Amino acid sequence: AECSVDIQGNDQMQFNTNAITVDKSCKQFTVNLSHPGNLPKNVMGHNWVLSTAADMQGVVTDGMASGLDKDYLKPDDSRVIAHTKLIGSGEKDSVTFDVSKLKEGEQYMFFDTFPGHSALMKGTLTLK
């Protein structure tokens, strides 16, 4: 039915939503990320990363390891199923993945890899 969602990230270091449900009917699914903040990408760096909960941690750590020039995402991370590009206030981005990469029964989670954001910026993506 509906296969698009508008996820926001503000200067207060928080997503405008904390749960996404993807209609199995969707062949693909896209999320649009915008930054209604005022703080630049190096200060208030916001992105949207998807991955199962089991790897929500590592992906977040290794992502801290890398840096601004790496989008705070480790390069060649097979743990991430989909991801936006780290953006700063005023910016927007959207990623369109195939819902076939997702699986029913399995719990996925989306978050932000910028250091110190994943605590106040995560959620659950539900496939049903």
- Site of interaction with Cu ion (CB under 5 A): 1, 25, 46, 112, 114, 117
Please report how close the Cβ of residue 1 comes to Cu ion at its closest, in angstroms. 4
SS (H, E, C) 77-122: CCCCCEECCCECCCCEEEEEEECCCCCCCCCEEEECCCCCCCCCCE
Identify which of residues 72 and 108 has a Cβ nearer to Cu ion in the complex: 72
What are the structure tokens assigned to 85, written together? Answer: 């590009």
Identify which of residues 62 and 112 has a Cβ nearer to Cu ion in the complex: 112
Please report how close the Cβ of residue 111 comes to Cu ion at its closest, in angstroms. 9
Please report how close the Cβ of residue 31 comes to Cu ion at its closest, in angstroms. 14
| Spatial distance between the Cα atoms of 122 and 7, rounded to a whole number of angstroms | 11
